[PDB]
Amino acid sequence: RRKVQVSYVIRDEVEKYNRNGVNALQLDPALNRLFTAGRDSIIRIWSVNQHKQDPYIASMEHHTDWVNDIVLCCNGKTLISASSDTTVKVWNAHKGFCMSTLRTHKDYVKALAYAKDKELVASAGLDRQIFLWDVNTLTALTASNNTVTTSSLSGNKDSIYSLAMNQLGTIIVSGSTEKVLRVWDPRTCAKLMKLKGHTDNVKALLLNRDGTQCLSGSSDGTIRLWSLGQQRCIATYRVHDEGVWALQVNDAFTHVYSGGRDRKIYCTDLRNPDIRVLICEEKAPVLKMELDRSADPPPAIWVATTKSTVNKWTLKGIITPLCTQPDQVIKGGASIIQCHIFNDKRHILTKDTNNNVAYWDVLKACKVEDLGKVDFEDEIKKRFKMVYVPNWFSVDLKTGMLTITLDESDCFAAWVSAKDAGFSSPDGSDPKLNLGGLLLQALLEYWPRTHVNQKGNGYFQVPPHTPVIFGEAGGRTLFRLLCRDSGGETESMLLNETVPQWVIDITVDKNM
Amino acid sequence: NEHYFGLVNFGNTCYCNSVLQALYFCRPFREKVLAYKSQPRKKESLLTCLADLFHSIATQKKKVGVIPPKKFITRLRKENELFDNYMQQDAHEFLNYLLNTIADILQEERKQEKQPDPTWVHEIFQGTLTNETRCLTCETISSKDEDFLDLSVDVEQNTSITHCLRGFSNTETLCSEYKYYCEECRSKQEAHKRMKVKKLPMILALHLKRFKYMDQLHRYTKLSYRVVFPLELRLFNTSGDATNPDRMYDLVAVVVHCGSGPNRGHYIAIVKSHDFWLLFDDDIVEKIDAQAIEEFYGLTSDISKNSESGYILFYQSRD
Amino acid sequence: MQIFVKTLTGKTITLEVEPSDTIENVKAKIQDKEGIPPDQQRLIFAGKQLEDGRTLSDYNIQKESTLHLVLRLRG
Ligand SMILES: [Zn+2]
């Protein structure tokens, strides 16, 4: 086993806007919808329609880490997602909820691949594994006589960062840190080719319908064109200074739209390189791009960056820029990017992506104050606290929102007097409190099993909407819920199955 | 010419004697030790003792003989509880203690006058590494510079020391459970990590990591692999500076550890003086031809059985 | 903060530490990943063998520092 930890997230109940960057994008032409895969763990649905003050439709919240890739399939009915939490999740795309979680990957799941004709999806990641998924089987709610087997490709010698298939599902390729592309035929699961060429990692793959020709975007800076039939690189395009992360192609397979670390997006005629249209200079590095495919002159392109806003840039004109201002902009929110823990081990200072500064109470699980763009290191010294308290929690900023994590090894290290905590403690004179215990009790307050024949710790409550997460240390997530919903019956049942013994002792048995 | 003197073993002090002989046959180190005069004439330290011992060998009347280093050993034992016994110790740990202890003494002398300058220990032995860590999502490079007095290099079977140095400076991928916390990405990601020599030392001390811990069986073994060391060694940096360095080094001393295991054994230094080779085994001094040096590469076969094997190599920058 | 240790085979592990951590704390974290008992460990950094009673800030050890791990051949 691994140790199981308890986490919570300091956030508003609904986070309309991405609170970190966005790694992937999908368009439903039919419904005029854009899916963004968050690095704030959240997948979102937007309408791509005229002058709506909120293009916001909905948040799909299940993942506990970056959502790295999303595929849309079965006529926009189902969404498949890959995450750094090591799970592939299956969603009803119309309703916006999670049908299944796949747990076959043992590391970050980095990429997805879609063969539209076969309704086939593939996942790959850092564990050097590739699994093949029949989507109709994944979404069938019927009882099946077939035992639900999986098939895996094998071959990669290190971590996989990009993956692609053709419409037919004739061929599949992966880009890994081992520089080669590797090629399989899905339906056979057999290796056809290994392609040598790139000198660095490759994060972007596209194929033509036929599975005869491939484009690959690399951190070495080169775009490449391949003949699968000839098993050889046939062209190599040096359009960027730094790595290429994102490629789109036109319907015809003649122009490539490329993006990367150097913030500059270029349409580029494959047949003759020299003609290159510098579309735009984005404010941050380009992670992924999605072509609007209404027209054969593809009208616009949607671009995902390390920033939380998403832009559509028009292609209406077709080495200064075509465009200088976003055709359409989806609002972003701020990521918290710096965290300092004071010596009292109760207060946090943060600086966010908008250089804003805030003061937070970890124990009471809430913002104390907004300080609006002061000098941050000064502020740390300005609020210095001459106390020794041992460390009892860690902070995680991977999603852009504050995630506090409690682990057995030191959850209970911190013993503090009630007056020093600043609690009324009106009766008589005050005692030793253990901050870990008090917080766990606040988190699991609504859980019926805590109550003894009074509720919680008594001294305070968390925001009732505070999500609480149980998960293995750098491993899979066992369960998540909102603090207030632990009073539900199904929720209580899951709490019995997942809350580990060490938490039980304090919260229900009422030990130290 | 010169003096060739063995050192008496007192209990189990070969870890110490072997290292003294290496260091005495590092001319630059020897000369600076002979030249040492204290800023405060008053008080006796590990350096004054090394200095008295070295004068004694250097100003001895006959060409060959034996010194008992009573007074250095006594001072060693007084300074360091780890060596205050008759138990066998590790030569490399002593070399590190010694050099740093001297360096600390000389640094105090500099400060003493004024009532972050480098001592001649650092001058002779210090090099510098640049460690680069490339985050694989964001593709940022983070560079940190770290000084060293020696390189402790891992070994593998039937290779040269030059291959080991290559191994040391190769790009490793931090992944799986060793992911890099990247401040850009605010998350753990895979990383490319490389340590490259940024600045070469006048004398390159190599420490061969001849140990393997068995996690299952709760103890470690001694690696007696063949690891070959050439008499001349060529090192370099790649581009990025006013000056590119491509330097020959000559082998001047090997501290050899004899035995089949890590917890006990014997130490002997081989050294080069005036282009031929001597072997010092405490009091015994014996001259050997250059080919005899290959016994100390280690065993091709019967690896479990008893070996005599290079452990610390001193390479001197050609001059 | 995160630091590295280069272990006996060459492989690098990561450790989560704080500047106030003692070298003993550090060797325990090594032990967790590597099995090697603190008393058999030696760590070299900036050319110094690190002393059990001292802290990482005592040696100015900062994020991304590499410690070199070695055992002993007694003799
Ligand atoms: Zn990064």
| Residue B86 contacts C where some CB pair is shorter than 8 Å | no
Its domain, for residue B161, covers 1-319
- DSSP letter (8 states) at residue B299: B
d(CA A279, CA A321): 5
- Could you identify the residue written with the tokens 């966005």? A22
The pairing of strands B151-154 and B203-209 is: parallel
- DSSP letter (8 states) at residue B119: P
Report whether A139 contacts A78 (CB < 8 A): yes
Give A109 Cα–ligand 1 centroid separation in angstroms.
Answer: 17
Q: Single out the residue of A333, A404, A480, A399 nearest to residue A40, CA to CA.
A: A399
Q: Which candidate in B88, B211, B281 is best for mutational testing of the C interface (most C CBs within 10 A)?
A: B211
Report whether A337 contacts A397 (CB < 8 A): yes
Report whether B119 contacts B107 (CB < 8 A): yes
Residue of B nearest to C51 (CA): B97
How many helices and strands in chain B, by DSSP H and E?
A: 7, 20
Query: Which of C40, C47, C49 is nearest residue B126 as measured by Cβ atoms?
Result: C47
Report whether A285 contacts A305 (CB < 8 A): yes
Residue of B nearest to C67 (CA): B146
Tell me what percent of chain C is helix, strand and coil, each rounded to the nearest 5: 25, 30, 45
Report CA A512 to chain centroid distance, whole Å: 37
Residue-range domains of chain A with CATH: 104-140+148-238 (2.130.10.10), 336-507 (no CATH)
The pairing of strands B227-228 and B159-160 is: parallel
d(CA A59, CA B123): 62
Q: Which long-range contacts (CB under 8 A, 24 or more apart) does B165-168 make?
A: B165/B206, B165/B235, B167/C10, B168/B195, B168/C10
d(CA A198, CA A236): 10
Contacts of B190 in chain A (CB under 8 A): 126, 159, 177
Beta bridge partners of A56: A46
Q: Residue B175: how many CA atoms within 13 Å on its side-chain side?
A: 18
Report whether A292 contacts A27 (CB < 8 A): yes
- Supply the DSSP string of A422-482, one letter for each residue: T----SSS--EEEHHHHHHHHHTTT-GGG-----S-SS----TT-EEEEEETTS-EEEEEE
Task: Report the structure determination method.
Answer: X-ray
B14 is catalytic: yes
Report CB contact under 8 Å: B176, A126. yes
Give the tokens for residue B79. 């300074």
Residue of B nearest to A400 (CA): B186
| Residue B44 contacts C where some CB pair is shorter than 8 Å | no
Q: Single out the residue of B181, B14, B129, B261 nearest to residue C44, CA to CA.
A: B129
Amino acid at A422: G
The pairing of strands C66-70 and C2-6 is: parallel
Q: What's the burial of A275, exposed, middle or buried (CB within 10 Å: 0-12/13-18/19+)?
A: exposed
The phi-psi region of residue A211 (left if phi > 0; otherwise alpha if psi is between -120 and 50; otherwise beta) is left
Report whether A77 contacts A90 (CB < 8 A): no
Q: E strands within A93-228?
A: 97-102, 109-115, 120-125, 130-134, 151-153, 160-165, 172-176, 181-185, 190-195, 202-207, 213-218, 222-227
Q: What's the burial of A352, exposed, middle or buried (CB within 10 Å: 0-12/13-18/19+)?
A: middle
d(CA B215, CA C35): 6
Phi (first) and psi of residue C27, to 5 degrees: -70, -30
Cβ-Cβ contacts under 8 Å for A287 (sequence gap 6 or more)? A21, A22, A23, A24, A245, A246, A304, A305, A306
Element housing B278 (H / E): strand B276-281
Element housing B120 (H / E): helix B120-125
The pairing of strands A366-370 and A394-396 is: unpaired
Give the tokens for residue A343. 């010596």
B182 annotated ligand-binding residue: yes
State the SS3 of A367-396: EEEECCCCCHHHHHHHCCCCCCCCCCCEEE
d(CA A45, CA A60): 8
Phi (first) and psi of residue B290, to 5 degrees: -55, -35
Report whether B122 contacts B103 (CB < 8 A): yes
Count of pairs with CB atoms under 8 A, one residue in B, one in C: 120
Contacts of A402 in chain B (CB under 8 A): none
Cβ-Cβ contacts under 8 Å for A149 (sequence gap 6 or more)? none
- Could you identify the residue written with the tokens 């001592």? B119
Phi (first) and psi of residue A142, to 5 degrees: -85, 155
Virtual torsion, Cα B169, B175, B179, B180, nearest 10 deg: 30
Query: Which of A201, A306, A474 is nearest residue B136 as measured by Cβ atoms?
Result: A201
Element housing B70 (H / E): helix B70-79
- Could you identify the residue written with the tokens 């046939």? A234
B135 annotated ligand-binding residue: yes
First to last CA, chain C: 38
d(CA A507, CA A444): 7
CB atoms within 10 A of CB A454: 8
Give A181 Cα–ligand 1 centroid separation in angstroms.
Answer: 23
CA–CA min distance C37, chain B (Å): 9
Phi (first) and psi of residue C20, to 5 degrees: -85, -5
d(CA A107, CA A124): 10
d(CA C7, CA C44): 11
d(CA B223, CA B209): 8
- Which partners does chain C have (≥3 C-beta pairs < 8 Å)? B
| Residue B61 contacts A where some CB pair is shorter than 8 Å | no
- DSSP letter (8 states) at residue B177: G
Number of domains in chain B: 1
d(CA A248, CA A217): 10
- Supply the DSSP string of A334-375, one letter for each residue: PPEEEEEE-TTSSEEEEEETTS-EEEEETTTTEEEEE--S--
Cβ-Cβ contacts under 8 Å for A403 (sequence gap 6 or more)? A7, A8, A9, A395, A396, A397, A469
Q: Single out the residue of B282, B194, B262, B275 nearest to residue B231, CA to CA.
A: B275
The phi-psi region of residue A402 (left if phi > 0; otherwise alpha if psi is between -120 and 50; otherwise beta) is beta
Q: Single out the residue of A290, A283, A211 nearest to residue A247, CA to CA.
A: A290
Give the SS3 label for residue A486: helix
User: What length does chain B have?
Assistant: 319
CA–CA min distance B187, chain A (Å): 5
Give the SS3 label for residue A142: coil
B218 is catalytic: no
Q: Residue A402: how many CA atoms within 13 Å on its side-chain side?
A: 26
State the SS3 of A222-289: EEEEEECCCCEEEEEEECCCCCEEEEEECCCCCEEEEEECCCEEEEEECCCCCCEEEEEECCCCEEEE
Cβ-Cβ contacts under 8 Å for B314 (sequence gap 6 or more)? B22, B25, B26, B203, B204, B205, B206, B251, B252, B253, B254
Give B140 Cα–ligand 1 centroid separation in angstroms.
Answer: 6
CA–CA min distance A244, chain B (Å): 11
Q: Give CA separation, A115 vs A253, A367, B170, in Å.
A: 17, 46, 39
Amino acid at B42: K
Q: What's the burial of A144, exposed, middle or buried (CB within 10 Å: 0-12/13-18/19+)?
A: exposed
Contacts of B213 in chain C (CB under 8 A): 8, 34-36, 40, 71
Query: Which of C8, C13, C62 is nearest residue B178 as measured by Cβ atoms?
Result: C13
Report whether A335 contacts A352 (CB < 8 A): yes
Contacts of B198 in chain C (CB under 8 A): none
Amino acid at B294: E
Query: Which of A84, A177, A306 is nearest residue B136 as measured by Cβ atoms?
Result: A177
- Supply the DSSP string of A8-30, one letter for each residue: EEE--S---S-SS-EEEEEEETT
Angle at which helices B91-114 and B14-24 cross, to 10° = 60
Report CA B292 to chain centroid distance, whole Å: 22
Give A74 Cα–ligand 1 centroid separation in angstroms.
Answer: 35
d(CA A26, CA A45): 10
Give the tokens for residue A483. 């603090």
Q: Could you say which of B3, B14, B49, B122 is catalytic? A: B14
Number of domains in chain C: 1
Give B63 Cα–ligand 1 centroid separation in angstroms.
Answer: 63
- Supply the DSSP string of A282-320, one letter for each residue: -SS-EEEEEE--SSSS--EEEEEESSS-EEEEE------
Contacts of B148 in chain C (CB under 8 A): 44, 46-47
Contacts of A400 in chain B (CB under 8 A): 186
Q: Residue A435: how many CA atoms within 13 Å on its side-chain side?
A: 26
Report whether A140 contacts A128 (CB < 8 A): no
Q: Single out the residue of A377, A388, A399, A412 nearest to residue A503, CA to CA.
A: A412
Give the tokens for residue A450. 């805590």
Beta bridge partners of B270: B254, B279
Virtual torsion, Cα B257, B259, B263, B268, nearest 10 deg: -30
Element housing A496 (H / E): helix A489-498
Contacts of B138 in chain A (CB under 8 A): 285, 306
| Residue B90 contacts C where some CB pair is shorter than 8 Å | yes
Q: Give CA separation, B157 vs B259, B260, C11, C70, in Å.
A: 18, 16, 17, 18
Q: Single out the residue of A428, A350, A422, A409 nearest to residue A383, CA to CA.
A: A350
d(CA B43, CA B41): 6
d(CA A190, CA A171): 10
B185 annotated ligand-binding residue: yes
d(CA C62, CA B8): 43
| Residue B223 contacts C where some CB pair is shorter than 8 Å | no
Report whether A164 contacts A178 (CB < 8 A): no
Report whether A104 contacts A129 (CB < 8 A): yes
Q: Could you say which of B3, B163, B192, B266 is catalytic? A: B266
Contacts of B266 in chain C (CB under 8 A): 75
Query: Which of A159, A243, A397 is nearest residue B175 as measured by Cβ atoms?
Result: A159
Report CB contact under 8 Å: B186, A335. yes
d(CA C27, CA B123): 30
Lateral strand order in the sheet of A232-238: A202-207, A213-218, A222-227, A232-238
Give A363 Cα–ligand 1 centroid separation in angstroms.
Answer: 30
Query: Which of C8, C40, C66 is nearest residue B146 as measured by Cβ atoms?
Result: C66
Its domain, for residue C44, covers 1-75
Residue of B nearest to A402 (CA): B186
Report CA A65 to chain centroid distance, whole Å: 5
Report whether A334 contacts A322 (CB < 8 A): no
